[PDB]
Amino acid sequence: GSSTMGQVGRQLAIIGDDINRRYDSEFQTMLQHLQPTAENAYEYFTKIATSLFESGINWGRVVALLGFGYRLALHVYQHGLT
């Protein structure tokens, strides 16, 4: 409800909607360029994570990798459905 917990929850909804609208299109472009398959998806994800964390680590970088891994797995799943 209108409690302080309900206030924070609705503020995270706006942050998450802003994260989704700012980077989902970029995730799809990066996945289209990588052309990942079920054979090299985990190999790609490990190489990307090491290149990512080579310049440091913060919670923003971790949630970006989590969101990209989810789009990665979703991309390999849907492009194999025949």
Added chain:
Amino acid sequence: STMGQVGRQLAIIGDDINRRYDSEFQTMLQHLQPTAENAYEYFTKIATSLFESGINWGRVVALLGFGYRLALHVYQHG
């Protein structure tokens, strides 16, 4: 292109997420006044209030990032 470009682009995206919302996470934690005794209660009610208007991967990672910052706030203070 290569995995290096994608990895470096996620570093840019991740650093962008960090600068845009960390202060907002800080401001919400100061108003919440979370302690070791109500942290999971707060997280659960916040998640409920968050997902009452839908769910996408952005909302999930935002809740995960805030829950990390929430636990770290209770751990380091209390």
